[PDB]
Design a protein around this ligand. Structure first.
Ligand SMILES: [Cl-]
Length: 241
C-alpha cells in the first residue's frame, strides 16, 4: 500500500482530519496507485510564520483513471490545522474530480467541505453519479452553505458544513467515505470517451485548477511565510497544476 504511518503531523493534527486522512487512505488503497511526481522540495515543507513553525506533507499518486491524486496535510502555528485532498481525473475517462478540505484550530473544526465536481463542459455529473448521490439520502448538518459566486465550479451535492459537534464530524467523514466508494466504483467501470470529449473534460479540470488557483486562500499564508514567488510555484505546481 501507501500509508500515512510515517507522518510527523498525524499525531498532532485535529482528530477529524486524522479520520479523514485515514478514511481517504483506505479508499485510495483499494485503487491501483502509482507514484506521482511533485517537485522534490515540495513533498515536505517547513517554515516560519509570525514566529511559529509551519509544516506540510504532500502525498501524490496516480492511476490510469486519475491524472493526479493529492493529499495535503499541514500545521501552521499552534492553531491552523489543514487537510486538503483532490483527485484529478484523466480526461479520457470523463470522471468528476473529487475534493475536500478541513480547516481546524484550537476550538475544533471551523470548516469541512467535500464534493464531486463536474468536469463536463455543462457542469453536470454523469447520470450514474446522480443516481447514487441521490440514493444516499439528505445530509443533515447544523452549519452549512455560503459557497461564493465562483462556486460555479462545484456540483450540487457539495457538503460545506461547519461541524456543530463530534457526532457530525463522523457523519461528514462517512459521507466523504460514501462519495469515495461511489467514485472508486465508477472508476473501474469507466470507459474511454471520444477524443472530442477527452478534451472538454481536459477543459473542465483545466478550468477547475485555474479557478481554484485564483481563489484558494492557501496562497496568502504561503506568501507571508515564503513570499509571492514561492506561493505561486506551490499553487500551480502542487495544489491545482
Ligand atoms: Cl484574495
Amino acid at each position: 500500500d501507501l500509508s500515512l504511518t510515517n507522518s510527523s503531523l498525524m499525531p498532532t493534527l485535529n482528530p477529524m482530519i486524522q479520520q479523514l486522512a485515514l478514511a481517504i487512505a483506505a479508499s485510495w488503497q483499494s485503487l491501483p496507485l502509482k507514484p506521482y511526481q511533485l517537485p522534490e522540495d515540495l513533498g515536505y515543507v517547513e517554515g516560519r510564520l509570525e514566529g511559529e513553525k509551519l509544516v506540510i506533507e504532500n502525498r501524490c499518486y496516480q492511476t490510469p483513471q486519475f491524472r493526479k491524486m493529492h493529499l495535503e496535510l499541514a500545521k501552521v502555528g499552534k492553531g491552523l490545522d489543514i487537510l486538503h485532498c483532490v483527485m484529478f481525473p484523466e480526461p479520457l475517462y470523463g470522471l468528476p474530480l473529487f475534493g475536500c478540505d478541513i480547516v481546524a484550530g484550537p476550538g475544533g473544526v471551523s470548516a469541512a467541505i467535500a464534493d464531486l465536481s463536474p468536469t463536463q463542459s455543462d457542469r453536470q455529473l454523469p447520470a450514474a453519479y446522480q443516481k447514487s448521490l441521490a440514493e444516499l439520502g439528505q445530509p443533515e448538518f447544523e452549519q452549512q452553505r455560503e459557497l461564493p459566486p465562483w462556486g460555479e465550479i462545484f456540483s450540487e451535492y457539495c457538503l460545506f458544513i461547519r461541524p456543530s459537534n463530534v457526532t457530525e464530524e463522523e457523519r461528514f467523514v462517512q459521507r466523504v467515505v460514501d462519495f469515495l466508494q461511489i467514485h472508486c466504483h465508477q472508476s473501474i467501470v469507466a470507459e474511454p470517451l471520444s477524443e472530442a470529449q477527452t478534451l472538454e473534460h481536459r477543459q473542465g479540470q483545466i478550468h477547475y485548477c485555474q479557478q481554484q488557483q485564483k481563489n484558494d486562500k492557501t496562497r496568502r499564508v504561503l506568501e507571508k511565510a515564503f513570499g509571492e514567488a514561492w506561493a505561486e510555484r506551490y499553487m500551480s505546481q502542487v495544489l491545482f497544476d
